[PDB]
Design an enzyme around this catalytic site. Structure first.
Site, PDB file in Angstrom:
ATOM      1  CB  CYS A  32      -1.061   0.050   1.118  1.00 13.43           C
ATOM      2  SG  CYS A  32      -0.391  -0.473   2.802  1.00 13.43           S
ATOM      3  CB  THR A  33       3.884   2.313   2.242  1.00 15.85           C
ATOM      4  OG1 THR A  33       2.950   2.216   3.162  1.00 15.85           O
ATOM      5  CG2 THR A  33       4.881   3.263   2.264  1.00 15.85           C
ATOM      6  CG  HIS A  44       0.753   2.484   7.622  1.00 16.11           C
ATOM      7  ND1 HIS A  44      -0.444   1.748   7.923  1.00 16.11           N
ATOM      8  CD2 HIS A  44       0.955   2.215   6.539  1.00 16.11           C
ATOM      9  CE1 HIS A  44      -0.614   0.812   6.926  1.00 16.11           C
ATOM     10  NE2 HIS A  44       0.058   1.154   6.131  1.00 16.11           N
TER      11      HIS A  44
HETATM   12  N1  LIG Z   1      -4.263  -3.959   5.720  1.00 13.74           N
HETATM   13  C1  LIG Z   1      -3.852  -3.358   4.766  1.00 13.74           C
HETATM   14  O1  LIG Z   1      -3.554  -2.343   4.694  1.00 13.74           O
HETATM   15  C2  LIG Z   1      -2.828  -4.112   3.716  1.00 13.74           C
HETATM   16  C3  LIG Z   1      -2.812  -3.627   2.603  1.00 13.74           C
HETATM   17  C4  LIG Z   1      -2.018  -3.707   1.438  1.00 13.74           C
HETATM   18  C5  LIG Z   1      -1.486  -5.147   1.481  1.00 13.74           C
HETATM   19  N2  LIG Z   1      -1.715  -5.834   2.712  1.00 13.74           N
HETATM   20  C6  LIG Z   1      -1.028  -7.160   2.584  1.00 13.74           C
HETATM   21  O2  LIG Z   1      -2.062  -8.049   2.494  1.00 13.74           O
HETATM   22  C7  LIG Z   1      -2.002  -9.327   2.999  1.00 13.74           C
HETATM   23  C8  LIG Z   1      -3.370  -9.688   3.795  1.00 13.74           C
HETATM   24  O3  LIG Z   1      -3.273  -8.478   4.728  1.00 13.74           O
HETATM   25  P1  LIG Z   1      -4.803  -8.282   5.702  1.00 13.74           P
HETATM   26  O4  LIG Z   1      -4.767  -6.856   6.480  1.00 13.74           O
HETATM   27  O5  LIG Z   1      -5.731  -8.440   4.736  1.00 13.74           O
HETATM   28  O6  LIG Z   1      -5.112  -9.284   6.847  1.00 13.74           O
HETATM   29  P2  LIG Z   1      -5.852 -10.005   7.429  1.00 13.74           P
HETATM   30  O7  LIG Z   1      -5.435 -10.409   8.858  1.00 13.74           O
HETATM   31  O8  LIG Z   1      -7.193  -9.118   7.759  1.00 13.74           O
HETATM   32  O9  LIG Z   1      -6.430 -11.138   6.716  1.00 13.74           O
HETATM   33  C9  LIG Z   1      -5.811 -12.581   6.116  1.00 13.74           C
HETATM   34  C10 LIG Z   1      -6.997 -13.377   5.927  1.00 13.74           C
HETATM   35  O10 LIG Z   1      -6.351 -14.647   5.436  1.00 13.74           O
HETATM   36  C11 LIG Z   1      -7.091 -15.766   6.269  1.00 13.74           C
HETATM   37  N3  LIG Z   1      -6.070 -16.916   6.247  1.00 13.74           N
HETATM   38  C12 LIG Z   1      -4.822 -16.850   7.082  1.00 13.74           C
HETATM   39  N4  LIG Z   1      -4.110 -17.891   6.883  1.00 13.74           N
HETATM   40  C13 LIG Z   1      -4.705 -18.492   5.792  1.00 13.74           C
HETATM   41  C14 LIG Z   1      -4.609 -19.754   5.143  1.00 13.74           C
HETATM   42  N5  LIG Z   1      -3.597 -20.515   5.249  1.00 13.74           N
HETATM   43  N6  LIG Z   1      -5.330 -20.092   4.147  1.00 13.74           N
HETATM   44  C15 LIG Z   1      -6.526 -19.176   3.900  1.00 13.74           C
HETATM   45  N7  LIG Z   1      -6.786 -18.074   4.451  1.00 13.74           N
HETATM   46  C16 LIG Z   1      -6.029 -17.914   5.506  1.00 13.74           C
HETATM   47  C17 LIG Z   1      -7.462 -15.211   7.473  1.00 13.74           C
HETATM   48  O11 LIG Z   1      -8.393 -15.994   8.424  1.00 13.74           O
HETATM   49  C18 LIG Z   1      -7.981 -13.702   7.132  1.00 13.74           C
HETATM   50  O12 LIG Z   1      -9.178 -13.644   6.978  1.00 13.74           O
HETATM   51  C19 LIG Z   1      -0.751  -9.061   3.898  1.00 13.74           C
HETATM   52  O13 LIG Z   1       0.108  -9.842   3.066  1.00 13.74           O
HETATM   53  C20 LIG Z   1      -0.526  -7.706   4.011  1.00 13.74           C
HETATM   54  O14 LIG Z   1       0.672  -7.343   4.359  1.00 13.74           O
HETATM   55  C21 LIG Z   1      -2.430  -5.385   3.683  1.00 13.74           C
END
Ligand SMILES: NC(=O)c1ccc[n+]([C@@H]2O[C@H](COP(=O)([O-])OP(=O)(O)OC[C@H]3O[C@@H](n4cnc5c(N)ncnc54)[C@H](O)[C@@H]3O)[C@@H](O)[C@H]2O)c1
Ligand SMILES: NC(=O)c1ccc[n+]([C@@H]2O[C@H](COP(=O)([O-])OP(=O)(O)OC[C@H]3O[C@@H](n4cnc5c(N)ncnc54)[C@H](O)[C@@H]3O)[C@@H](O)[C@H]2O)c1
Ligand SMILES: NC(=O)c1ccc[n+]([C@@H]2O[C@H](COP(=O)([O-])OP(=O)(O)OC[C@H]3O[C@@H](n4cnc5c(N)ncnc54)[C@H](O)[C@@H]3O)[C@@H](O)[C@H]2O)c1
Ligand SMILES: NC(=O)c1ccc[n+]([C@@H]2O[C@H](COP(=O)([O-])OP(=O)(O)OC[C@H]3O[C@@H](n4cnc5c(N)ncnc54)[C@H](O)[C@@H]3O)[C@@H](O)[C@H]2O)c1
Lengths: 334, 334, 334, 334
Positions: free
Chosen positions: D151-152, D178
């Site tokens: 995102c950054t 953030h």
């Molecule tokens: N939150 C943000 O602003 C953001 C922004 C950009 C990118 N990201 C990246 O995207 C990814 C997800 O982030 P997030 O904030 O949505 O996290 P999150 O914790 O909200 O969601 C992850 C989801 O994956 C599910 N999960 C976990 N292990 C699993 C598995 N083995 N199989 C299937 N499902 C599984 C969890 O139950 C959860 O619903 C990370 O790599 C994060 O760095 C996050």
């Protein structure tokens, strides 16, 4: 003197540690968690809620050194491999939140511990104690898996006791407005409780509590007389019990407050406290008693329906009770 | 049709403005605050709680322009100087929080308006109304300065009416776990109430409320039967009422929920809502009804003691009732 | 020793008072505010950010009694009416936030005080001091109305002085990610600054700062080389400066850190601190130094561009410096 | 059109889902998580940050039904077992946060998917794309495991691009202030990063970032020229990039801003936006662009050092770009 080991060095585990440093009757010799010693030393040193531990903490190889004494660090996921017996641990504080059913908790006994205090409501335990309420019912010969109940039950039982003895409870309902805990989620993630799935710091979150019913375990006369709920809110520590009860006798606010103050100053000193100051939650952070009556909030309708509100530091008060119970137990012979 | 002026363009005045944009019957033509049109236009456009206003907003000289229509902005500290009559305002929404005594609110009448709606509990008002509970008690001739009560009273009354009519309340106690408001302090500052003096976003803050006694103004039969307290917590909007009552009829949880659901679908539709979903406070942000029963939290003890939990958007629902009252008053001839 | 009076017993006023209790060089004999003695005693006793004062606090008539010392309480809205002179007050701490122009501040000298410390950036002051940077510039004959600058400037100046002296700053930009203060609003209310008009605990709020420009008042060589902004965020205390500067010499992170560490242990001991721990803002609550380098964040690009991050308890560190300046000034002859 | 599967239906997964609803070009046919269809339906319907989903959502056995469309729900912890191929999924969005290394993400290819988009910085991917910066570099024949970066990085690269092209970047340092994410902890718990271990909503938490450095993946010319850090703060969503850069040419604030605005209105329309309003983080909740220049914050020192501030909805903007990339890849042939 009594050697204690802590299983699950989290909010309660580390607060118990902190409370134990003050007790010269107890000695924490080992802790178990899922991480390394460096991480534990750091979490023990710096607390977001309670500030810096005032004790020298360092790491000596794999162990923690606190004020010169070494504390063994284990990282065993399975209680059966703890080997409590080899290091002389007498009492184990079970504070992981994963082993509250007798089948899991008794593993510590099988591993050489003499007693186990579960830091939460349990399933099939020998006995559930609330210090100042029913510690007298503990049998050293028979009770080895002991539950210290919940923080909420520790808050409510001491004053429910007083009200019941004094005026008699017909029936009552409670609400605990409670700080968030590690059981909740930062941002909307799966949870067994769909309310507890939601962003913890952004809402008022209704959730069930078994604390009102659980009072019946330490105060048999109240079986089936209380029910209640919880409301999790955006604060990190300190909670409050709101109880509304129908009494047998007719009372006045002055009467209700006098009985509460008397008990806080007598029988329940150190467990139940009484305050006439208009304080807020932050003022109770660090409070070691189980329950502090907010006297200004006492209220009566028709001489028979009363509202009583009581504060509790859910990590500190509860952790001091765990230490109190460990000393009492040890005092009855190990 | 009926021209409205709003005195105090704050959380309630701006929320009343948003609600009036959807009302056929009233039209806001002027606002008064202590600031410039530029500041007001900014505040109206961008809301930290309710998001961006989906309307075209601009400033034309000293006026606000909203979707082509010009709104007059005044900056008069003294209601007496408002000159409502010259611009044709018939109804004034008194939302500053400073003119809740009839004497103060009557200054708008002197300035040319015909009716005044005070957006809070009042002193010496002609009548206090809770839409869906006692609007029928309004007399167009006798009542000129009308109080819409408080947000909590609007939440409690509609369901206290149902419970009473259906089962009979003997006595009851309420707690409102409520979001912070502009009456509180950011960081510990003098306040008349020493609890509201304290940092609003850092603590659970007990404070008094007259909302439970105030039900007696709109349901006379409950006079002296209820009392309650408030708990301000770290959320910016949305509150909940927790009522514990002793009923005259022996009831079940299913009968209580059925009576509530029945009223929400019927008589109290638009005012009382009923939910069987396990929701949290953020899901109620933007809710326009006065009260939404959290059906899952309903509990009974001994068939006589009940616990009813009801949500309310303290800004939106209350503002929508202000507009509803304004159009009801207009409908009765002015 | 030197008798001191405090004008404006708020966040800075009370924190100076707390600091002063453990300084044997000064003595607070009177405070001024807009409230009664009971409200101030309450606020002095219980603090949402810093906890309970460890001193015995009571009210004796119209005055405060702290550790057996009676403190005169005034409620004069006009400084000229304070009569500082009649009760022997030599130094006044001006912390209301309303009397930052030299002419307003000088009412205190009309009232009999000899010296005025304005606890914020001033207008027309005799001199602006940053303890540790230019206190040697104070002249007891020529300076009577002194500014202690802002909390931000007290964080930045001490380390900007070391970088400049050692490496030479060509130019640099700062961001202060700062806790919210009583200058902000609980929920969207008019404010001169449309950013500060917005709900303080709900957003990241960019706001202007004169602190980077104000470093030139204490470090003349840096005039026109630094500029910056602030970002107010949802925490109630503790702030951090992020400085990015282009240097004259080629450096390494190690070189820059060693320079800061040497200064923290030598010349700036007590003002500049140096930390190699991976701490967070809560860990610095209660911190008395003006500036603590977060050595883990020190970064260099191309040997010329450096990022330095320094923590600061904006209430405590600042308040201790007011106390230090009062003591310094008293040592120079009154 | 292109059939998309989502692995990890979390903050990013459900926001991608929301974004996809609007894209007629992409069709989400299945999702995988670790819970049941009832839980996922509830999480999709009610969001603590973005409000209620405006779509009809129900559960049809073990599947989600969204506005008539059945969405297959899987619950396989191991990607190898997803059998994407069997259900026709062409593109997989890998958003669990657990499979960012090529060896884990490639499992979706082995399960029948044609392309995988990792919603995070990756290790050993085929390519890393920032929409509007280097999507042109994508090779359908050769690139099958694709990172959409962070995102950054998505915030920074679009404007670092414009700045470099126009004036040329010598070196720059960034700080991202953030919102917290699910990677953090509610109350001090073990974490690999001891900063991220601490209570997320209670502090300002400094933490490393590779986003500055990762810009070089998409704008090769900037390799070794940028570095940065992050500060996590107590807000649930929306972040801001603060870049300080040494430029090659001499510019005016007015020159820089016109360059950004020109790009926002031309080249980068829909990716890069430009604002001259004095807004706050909550105002950007739901913002679908990648980067919104806070034009009022632009600052220049010595005509060579610039500060540019840019807002980003870290959930929404990133999520719309995931949908953008999917639609892009699809259009180049599967
Ligand atoms: N939150 C943000 O602003 C953001 C922004 C950009 C990118 N990201 C990246 O995207 C990814 C997800 O982030 P997030 O904030 O949505 O996290 P999150 O914790 O909200 O969601 C992850 C989801 O994956 C599910 N999960 C976990 N292990 C699993 C598995 N083995 N199989 C299937 N499902 C599984 C969890 O139950 C959860 O619903 C990370 O790599 C994060 O760095 C996050
Ligand atoms: N937090 C409170 O206010 C509170 C109050 C009273 C009682 N309790 C009860 O105390 C218990 C602990 O709650 P907490 O809030 O301290 O939780 P927590 O999440 O902070 O701490 C749990 C700790 O156990 C560790 N852990 C997890 N599984 C483990 C295993 N298999 N072996 C070893 N360590 C393991 C975790 O790493 C963590 O350090 C729960 O039963 C809770 O209900 C909590
Ligand atoms: N916020 C709520 O949930 C809520 C709900 C129901 C009823 N109320 C009541 O509504 C009233 C206002 O509450 P609020 O929360 O909107 O407050 P607020 O502080 O946000 O708004 C008050 C406004 O009135 C303006 N104002 C103050 N004095 C004025 C004067 N003399 N003339 C004109 N404008 C003046 C202020 O500039 C401000 O814009 C109070 O009586 C409050 O009890 C509030
Ligand atoms: N809070 C901080 O971090 C901080 C740090 C450094 C400097 N400062 C500066 O210190 C000053 C005070 O800041 P604060 O945060 O303590 O503010 P505050 O709002 O908490 O306190 C101001 C106090 O002054 C009293 N007051 C107001 N007008 C008065 C008058 N006319 N006469 C007497 N008393 C009066 C108020 O009742 C209140 O107690 C401001 O100039 C501020 O910029 C604040």
């Amino acid at each position: 003197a009594v050697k204690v080991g802590i299983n699950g060095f989290g909010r309660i585990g580390r607060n118990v540690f902190r409370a134990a440093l003050k007790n010269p009757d107890i000695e924490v010799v080992a802790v178990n968690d899922l991480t390394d010693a460096n991480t534990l030393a750091h979490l023990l040193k710096y607390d977001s809620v309670h500030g810096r531990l005032d004790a020298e903490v360092s790491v000596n190889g794999n162990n923690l050194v606190v004020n010169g004494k070494e504390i063994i660090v284990k990282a065993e996921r399975d209680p059966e491999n703890l080997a409590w017996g080899e290091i002389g641990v007498d009492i184990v504080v079970e504070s992981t939140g994963r082993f509250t059913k007798r089948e899991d908790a008794a593993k510590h006994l099988e591993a050489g511990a003499k007693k186990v205090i579960i830091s939460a409501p349990a399933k099939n335990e020998d006995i559930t104690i609330v210090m100042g309420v029913n510690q007298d019912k503990y049998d050293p010969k028979a009770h080895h898996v002991i539950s210290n109940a919940s923080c909420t039950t520790n808050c409510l039982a001491p004053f429910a006791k007083v009200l019941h003895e004094q005026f008699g409870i017909v029936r009552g309902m409670m609400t605990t407005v409670h700080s968030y805990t590690n059981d909740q989620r930062i941002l909307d993630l799966p949870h067994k409780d769909l309310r507890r799935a939601r962003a913890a710091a952004e809402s008022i979150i209704p959730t069930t509590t078994g604390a009102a019913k659980a009072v019946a375990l330490v105060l048999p006369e109240l079986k089936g007389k209380l029910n209640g709920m919880a409301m999790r809110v955006p604060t990190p520590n300190v909670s409050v019990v709101d109880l509304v009860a129908e009494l047998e006798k007719e009372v006045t606010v002055e009467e209700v407050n006098a009985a509460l103050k008397a008990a806080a100053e007598g029988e329940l000193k150190g467990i139940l406290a009484y305050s006439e100051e208009p304080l807020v939650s932050r003022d109770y952070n660090g409070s070691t008693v189980s329950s502090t009556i907010d006297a200004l909030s006492t209220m009566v309708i028709d001489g028979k329906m009363v509202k009583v509100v009581s504060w509790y530091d859910n990590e500190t008060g509860y952790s001091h009770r765990v230490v109190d119970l460990a000393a009492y137990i040890a005092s009855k012979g190990l």
